[PDB]
Amino acid sequence: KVFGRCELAAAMKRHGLDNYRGYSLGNWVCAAKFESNFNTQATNRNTDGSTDYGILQINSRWWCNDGRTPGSRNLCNIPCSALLSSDITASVNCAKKIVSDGNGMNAWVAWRNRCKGTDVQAWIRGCRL
Ligand code: NA
Incomplete structure (x- = not known):
């Protein structure tokens, strides 16, 4: 599934990411x-x-099992395929563990490089939340 911007903002809010x-x-x-x-x-x-x-590009090195990442962990206790579902529950639950791990959203290098410090509210502008 390809979410709409405000459709994804709504799903993330429902799943308690806000x-x-x-x-x-x-x-x-x-x-x-x-x-x-x-x-x-x-x-x-x-x-x-x-x-x-998946939507938040969670890495098999630590967070999910894909059977082909030598020496890795599965700290979210899920098959990585669960992160590709049209239902974002597994991605959100696993993202909550990642962002709790000590470095906050810096875990997502694209967040650090493209989102951190920017006007992120623009991403939910005009959405009915
Ligand atoms: Na793994």
């Missing part, structure tokens, strides 16, 4: 835009052989 660990909803929408272009099916291989999955 101001989770102090990150306003526009931060999460901005991160999703640059990680996945709002596509739940997005996958990208990393140079280290790990893979990033």
Whole structure:
């Protein structure tokens, strides 16, 4: 599924991401835009052989099991395929653990590089929330 901007903002809010660990909803929408272009099916291989999955490009190195990432963990206790569902529940639940891990949203390098410090509220402008 490719979400609409305000459709994803609504789903993230429903799943309790809005101001989770102090990150306003526009931060999460901005991160999703640059990680996945709002596509739940997005996958990208990393140079280290790990893979990033779903709207928030969660990495098999630590967070999910894909069976092909040697020496990795599965700290969200999920198959990485769950992160590609049209239902964002598994991505949101796993993103809450990641953003709690100590470095906040810096875990998402595209958030640090393209969202951090910007006018992230623009990402939820005009949305009925
Ligand atoms: Na893994």
